[PDB]
Amino acid sequence: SFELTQPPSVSVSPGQTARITCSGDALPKQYVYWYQQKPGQAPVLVIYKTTERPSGIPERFSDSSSGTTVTLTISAAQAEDEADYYCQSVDSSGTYVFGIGTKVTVLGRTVAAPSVFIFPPSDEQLKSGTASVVCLLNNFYPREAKVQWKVDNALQSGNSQESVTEQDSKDSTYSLSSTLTLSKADYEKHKVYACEVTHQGLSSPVTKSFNRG
Amino acid sequence: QVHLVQSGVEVKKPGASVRVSCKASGYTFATYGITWVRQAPGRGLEWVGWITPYNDRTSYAQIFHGRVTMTTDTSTNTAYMELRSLRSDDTAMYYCARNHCNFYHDFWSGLDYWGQGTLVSVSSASTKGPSVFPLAPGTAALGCLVKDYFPEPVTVSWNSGALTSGVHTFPAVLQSSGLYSLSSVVTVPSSSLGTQTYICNVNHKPSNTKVDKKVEP
Amino acid sequence: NDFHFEVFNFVPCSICSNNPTCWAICKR
């Protein structure tokens, strides 16, 4: 099938204009469809037949063409417009093609540094032969954050897993947990447990730590 | 007035097969097609294929040839997608959607109405209830670690729902064992650590696990 | 003559062959 090319990501400041392009050598002969997919929802058709907007889609959304390129324009972008946008077309035989999807971030101007907390393993888990050490980042924005584990001042790799919320509903910020999992035997071989955090809101990386015992 | 309603979550072992249904209402089912689209976690929309009931014709993306079968039952106005020989990377949200071929102007349409999605999870893990461990220490943080369970989902409340401000329950992570873990944390005044009691309520219905854990400083 | 968001799409009887579903819903 012919390819549809759209950028993997677009950032727009709140109230500014986002432009998402979709190019393909077949577009001069075929219609383009755009779908919006918000986190945790099914895709919704927002533009069809290249220029038509279904009833109920905000007038902020419009689509124009220029050569082999179609541009979905989101005027005066609203926080609720943050979503993945897929362009889509078909050939005359019925093969359907989707672009990779563009993650449109409505990137707020506020930079909120994370609060950092660290949790030693519980004595209850230790009795079971495993030690999970948890580092929590709270109330930060934007989402980009680096968390590094240091055990006895040695950088770790391969033994931690991270999880980030979707944007908190009220504060519109993120939280992040990083969990370092060791055996009780390895946990008891070390003294200092630390997570070091880098984020745009922090002038320099910050470290939270505890000493075992 | 158009609705497409899909069948519920599927948890399958590698090599098994799965069937997903898509029940239509509010239109003349036999004049439109049904399209299936797949979405792996964190990835984009992948066309699976379509089926048109008025000629029983089907078109599948090449990668699904021999493994996927779409059928339509015009007597129950239901479409089905069967996927055989499941592998871990078949784990995805599967959507049905309504398409058609405009015969006047000779073009295939966009996907105007969508089903709600069916999650199909493929793994060899077996059902297991979680272990629940306390996460204990301006603002203080405390929580519960909900570790080594299968399958999704788990629900977590604090103080039986009386405590909602400052609660953050994280998406589960898939561990290399195939089991899930998550944490749920709350931020509270350090003032309150000695005065107020904090209990996390964890419910894992697939294993009939309900745990309350008192988290103390 | 567009059928996005409509309830009935026009299928011409010329394509129905011996498919009974097609004949049930087709239009001349």
- Name the domain count of chain A: 2
DSSP state of A80: G
Nearest by CB to A94, from B59, B95, B175: name it.
Answer: B59
| CA C2, C4, C9, C15 torsion-angle sign | positive
- To the nearest whole angstrom, how far is the Cα of A131 from the nearest Cα of chain B? 11
Query: What is the CA B68 to chain-centroid distance, rounded?
Result: 20
Q: Name the domain boundary from A106, A141, A161.
A: A106
Domain match, A127 and A184 both: yes
Tell me the one-letter amino acid at B111. Answer: L
Residue A163 maps to a domain: yes
Helices (H), chain B: none
Q: Name the domain boundary from A53, A85, A106.
A: A106
Domain match, A124 and A196 both: yes
Query: What is the CA A60 to chain-centroid distance, rounded?
Result: 24
What count of other Cβ atoms lies within 10 Å of the Cβ of residue A196? Answer: 17
Separation of alpha carbons B104 and C1, rounded Å: 7
Domain match, A80 and A158 both: no
| Domains annotated on chain B, with CATH | 3-122 (2.60.40.10), 131-214 (2.60.40.10)
Separation of alpha carbons A47 and A169, rounded Å: 28
Residue A101 maps to a domain: yes
Residue A178 maps to a domain: yes
Q: Name the domain boundary from A50, A71, A106.
A: A106
Residue A168 maps to a domain: yes
**Domain interval for residue A141:** 115-211
CA nearest to C2 within chain A: A49
Separation of alpha carbons B100 and B22, rounded Å: 16
DSSP A22-71: EE-TTTTTS--EEEEE-TTS--EEEEBTTTB--TTS-TTEEEEEETTEEE
Domain match, A134 and A197 both: yes
* Interface contact C1, partner B, CB < 8 A: yes
Contact B57, B34 (CB under 8 A): no
Contact A44, B114 (CB under 8 A): yes
Residue/partner pairs of A200-208 with CB below 8 Å, 24 or more apart? A200/A111, A200/A142, A200/A144, A201/A111, A201/A112, A201/A113, A201/A114, A201/A140, A201/A141, A202/A113, A202/A114, A206/A116, A207/A150, A208/A116, A208/A117, A208/A118, A208/A135
Closest CA to B156 of B137, B174, B138, B135: B135
* Burial call A74-106: b when 16+ CB within 10 Å, e when fewer: bbebeeebbbbbbbbbbeeebbbbbbbbbbbbb
Cβ separation C5–A54 shorter than 8 A: yes
Domain match, A96 and A121 both: no
Residue A41 maps to a domain: yes
Q: How far apart are the first and last CA of chain B?
A: 55
Residue A3 maps to a domain: no
Closest CA to B133 of A124, A130, A183, A160: A124
DSSP state of B96: E
> Residue A49: its chain C contacts at CB < 8 A?
2, 4
Closest CA to B186 of C10, A42, A117: A117
Domain match, A19 and A101 both: yes
* Angstrom resolution of this structure: 1.7
Residue A1 maps to a domain: no
Closest CA to A84 of A17, A21, A15, A8: A8
DSSP chain C: ---TT-S----BGGG-TT-HHHHHH-B-
Instruction: State the method.
Output: X-ray
> CA of B104: how far to CAs of A30, A89, A94, in Å?
15, 19, 15
Domain match, A89 and A162 both: no
Cβ separation B28–C1 shorter than 8 A: no
- To the nearest whole angstrom, how far is the Cα of C24 from the nearest Cα of chain A? 24
Residues preceding gaps in chain C (C to N > 2.5 Å): none
Separation of alpha carbons B192 and A181, rounded Å: 30
Separation of alpha carbons A144 and B107, rounded Å: 43
Q: Which H or E run includes B143?
A: strand B139-149
Separation of alpha carbons B39 and A185, rounded Å: 41
Residue A200 maps to a domain: yes
CATH number, residue A16: 2.60.40.10
Cβ separation A49–C4 shorter than 8 A: yes
Domain match, A89 and A124 both: no
Domain match, A189 and A156 both: yes
What count of other Cβ atoms lies within 10 Å of the Cβ of residue A133? Answer: 22
Q: What SS3 class is residue B145?
A: strand
Separation of alpha carbons A194 and A155, rounded Å: 10
* Interface contact C5, partner A, CB < 8 A: yes
Domain match, A98 and A124 both: no
